[PDB]
Design a protein around this ligand. Structure first.
Ligand SMILES: Nc1ncnc2c1ncn2[C@@H]1O[C@H](COP(=O)(O)OP(=O)(O)NP(=O)(O)O)[C@@H](O)[C@H]1O
Ligand SMILES: [Ca+2]
Ligand SMILES: [Ca+2]
Ligand SMILES: [Ca+2]
Ligand SMILES: [Ca+2]
Ligand SMILES: [Ca+2]
Ligand SMILES: [Ca+2]
Ligand SMILES: [Mg+2]
Length: 470
């Protein structure tokens, strides 16, 4: 795919919409309640719009560790991974504005229901492994995968769960081994205790989770870190006959793979996702999904972002302003189209999605491969050759939902950093993280919008531009 390595033009990703806010946090949000706990996590409400956010309040050298977490979080775009919105800073604290999940921790579900049948466990595991697969492909290792760091989007529902808490996470290279001893005793991979490892430590932590879901207790037990660590180091675990006699061979086989002591021979997250057990509980597009599939793929097929200001706006609204409920059905379609569960849609996956849709509805022979190549030119905001979650939401949701006055005003205000009421060439270049943009790039924005010929874009002009795209 060397075509995606050259002559790409301006790339846009959701990380670019996270700005370090110089304003006082208390002027944008108010406290609702304390969610927990380093510092505190608070449920807060936006003074404008009254949307709810989980604000992680981190107490203040160590600013290196916080800036790394911020850079990791900024890059995350996946249905089963926490979304970061904004960052504030004051004298004693850093504030991380994240998406609030009301269903509580997976751990609490474990307390309440003791163990899960295989259907529920597989549903939980496919989501964790999808998140982890996506992390590892984006050169991120989580290092604290455990049920306390998995949250439920909705109360008592396992439909969509979220990986949170990237405080121990790191970027990783294939060319260097990781060395810091970090984790939680039940879940920590033996090679992490030996202080020499790679991303395979997360797979092991997932193998510990799966084991727990299926029987209610950890494979390397004990009641203090010291005892647990001793058992983890040794690496031996057992499927107690009475507790496991009615659990399928496939489940036990996946666990064995995920808990393979040698980390080079341990399966990848991708391989775990391709196991018989995970495949057995597959949730793919069927006739029930035809209406949302049709709306989604019809919108995608028709998508034009026009010039760079409009494209920037669209990805902003889609990636940061749409609610979990608004996204519910599209999130469900995204996951179903994502056959390999890596959290990206590839060309082979989109072709298959369109073929499945055409088969539900028989006309002229279409060249579906060429149609998808063309769709990718328009919808791939970050120019990486794949469709990520937020790109998908942004091009598949109705413009009627995205382009509310309130959302257009929010988009305008994010671009207009000096609050001058006009967006300049330089403000657009700053949004995209570039020293400057070409005269042609800005002139393409202007031609479609600048009604008063001042080489800048005001809110009225912005709104008219955006509605002309509808
Ligand atoms: N986005 C969120 N939505 C809902 N609750 C959250 C969210 N983020 C964190 N919490 C809760 O706040 C508490 C976290 O404190 P703790 O259990 O020590 O982990 P931590 O590493 O200190 N930070 P974290 O797990 O990210 O909050 C837990 O109850 C979390 O479930
Ligand atoms: Ca190219
Ligand atoms: Ca935590
Ligand atoms: Ca995929
Ligand atoms: Ca992309
Ligand atoms: Ca301005
Ligand atoms: Ca103007
Ligand atoms: Mg933590």
């Amino acid at each position: 795919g060397r075509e995606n390595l050259y002559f790409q033009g301006i790339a846009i990703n959701p990380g670019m919409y996270v700005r370090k806010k110089e304003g006082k946090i208390g002027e944008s949000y108010f406290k609702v309640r304390k969610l927990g706990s380093y510092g505190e996590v608070l449920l807060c409400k936006e003074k404008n719009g009254h949307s709810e956010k989980a604000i992680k309040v981190i107490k203040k050298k160590f600013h290196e560790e916080i800036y790394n977490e911020i850079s990791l979080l900024k890059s995350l775009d996946h249905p089963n991974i926490i979304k970061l919105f904004d960052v504030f800073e004051d004298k004693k604290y850093f504030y991380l504005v994240t998406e609030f999940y009301e269903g509580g921790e997976l751990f609490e579900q474990i307390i309440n229901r003791h163990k899960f049948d295989e259907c529920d466990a597989a549903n939980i595991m496919k989501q964790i492994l999808s998140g982890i697969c996506y992390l590892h492909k984006h050169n991120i290792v989580h290092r604290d995968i455990k049920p306390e760091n998995i949250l439920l989007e909705n109360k008592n529902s396992l439909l969509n769960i979220k990986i949170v808490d990237f405080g121990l996470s790191s970027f990783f290279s294939k060319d260097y081994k990781l060395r810091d001893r970090l984790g939680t005793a039940y879940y920590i991979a033996p090679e992490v205790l030996k202080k020499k490892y790679n991303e395979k430590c997360d797979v092991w932590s997932c193998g510990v989770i799966m084991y727990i879901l299926l029987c209610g207790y950890p494979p390397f037990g004990g009641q203090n870190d010291q005892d647990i660590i001793k058992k983890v180091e040794k690496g031996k675990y057992y499927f107690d006959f009475n507790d496991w006699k009615n659990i399928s061979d496939e489940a036990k086989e996946l666990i064995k793979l995920m808990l393979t002591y040698d980390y080079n021979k341990r399966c990848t997250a991708e391989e775990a996702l391709n196991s018989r057990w995970i495949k057995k509980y597959a949730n793919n597009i069927n006739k029930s999904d035809q209406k949302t599939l049709c709306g989604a793929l019809s919108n995608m097929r028709k998508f034009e972002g026009s010039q760079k200001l409009a494209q920037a706006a669209i990805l902003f609204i889609g990636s940061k302003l749409t609610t979990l409920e608004e996204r519910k059905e599209l999130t469900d379609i995204f996951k179903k189209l994502d056959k390999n569960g890596d959290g990206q849609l590839d060309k082979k996956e989109l072709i298959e999605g369109y073929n499945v849709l055409r088969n539900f509805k028989l006309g002229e022979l279409k060249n579906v491969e060429e149609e998808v190549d063309n769709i990718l030119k328009e919808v791939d905001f970050d120019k990486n050759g794949y469709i990520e979650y937020s790109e998908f939401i942004s091009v598949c949701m109705d413009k009627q939902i995205l382009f509310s006055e309130e959302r257009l005003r929010r988009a305008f205000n994010l671009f207009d950093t000096d609050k001058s009421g006009k967006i300049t060439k330089e403000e657009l270049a700053n949004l995209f993280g570039l020293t400057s943009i070409s005269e042609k790039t800005w002139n393409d924005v202007l031609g479609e919008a600048d009604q008063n010929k001042d080489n800048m874009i005001d809110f009225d002009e912005f709104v008219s531009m955006m509605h002309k795209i509808c």
